[PDB]
Amino acid sequence: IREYEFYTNPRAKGKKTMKFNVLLTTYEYILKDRAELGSIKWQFMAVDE
DNA sequence: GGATGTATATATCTGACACGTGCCTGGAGACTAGGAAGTAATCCCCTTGGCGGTTAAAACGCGGGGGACAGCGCGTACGTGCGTTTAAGCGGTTGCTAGAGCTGTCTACGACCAATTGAGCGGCCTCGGCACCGGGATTCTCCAGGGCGGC
């Protein structure tokens, strides 16, 4: 998911723009991948339950 | 008829009991201070019974070969016994010194107490270094015009 679907230009190494619109995830992968998801300029957060 | 085996009595040896004495250490009596028991408050860790999700460890099965074990041979090294040597064990000399025990004197060193202050613990601000964002320089892919060929 990370290197085939996050970025429009995943093979670059400078500023990588985002490709997806909405990312659905769970709490376990918020805790597991906070380093790879906290460094994203999110426009909206919706926390269910 | 003579000497031998055995029983009872008497003197001597030896461990144990009680008497005597010192002395010094434990006990009795009194006083005091502080160690610890008890109390209240605050805050953080542990308990018991659950749920959810990841995932790597645990469990199970199976094939195969490496290793444990048994047996056998062999040769060597240790046990065994005897004769010989030697040194341990005991008793002994002869002086001097080390050390335990006791008594005595004294002095420097450590306990103790009051005042002081400066080194240890916590937080706060700043720097060294790492990292995020904006701007300039360099290289790669591409769309269109000019020229040539065919019916």
Swiss-Prot record:
Tell me the leader sequence span: none
> Phenotype upon knockout?
Decreased sensitivity to the cytotoxic effects of 6-azauracil.
Q: Where is this chain's protein located in or outside the cell? A: Nucleus
- To which protein family does this belong? Belongs to the SNF2/RAD54 helicase family.
The remark listed among the other comments is:
Present with 1620 molecules/cell in log phase SD medium.
Q: What does this protein do?
A: ATP-dependent chromatin-remodeling factor which functions as substrate recognition component of the transcription regulatory histone acetylation (HAT) complexes SAGA and SLIK. It recognizes H3K4me. SAGA is involved in RNA polymerase II-dependent transcriptional regulation of approximately 10% of yeast genes. At the promoters, SAGA is required for recruitment of the basal transcription machinery.
Assembly, in brief, is:
Component of the 1.8 MDa SAGA complex, which consists of at least of TRA1, CHD1, SPT7, TAF5, ADA3, SGF73, SPT20/ADA5, SPT8, TAF12, TAF6, HFI1/ADA1, UBP8, GCN5, ADA2, SPT3, SGF29, TAF10, TAF9, SGF11 and SUS1. TAF5, TAF6, TAF9, TAF19, TAF12 and ADA1 seem to be present in 2 copies. SAGA is built of 5 distinct domains with specialized functions. Domain I (containing TRA1) probably represents the activator interaction surface.
Domain text: The 2 chromodomains are involved in the binding to the histone H3 methyllysine at position 4 (H3K4me3).
Name of this protein: Chromo domain-containing protein 1
Q: Which residues of the full protein are shown?
A: 466 to 514 of 1468
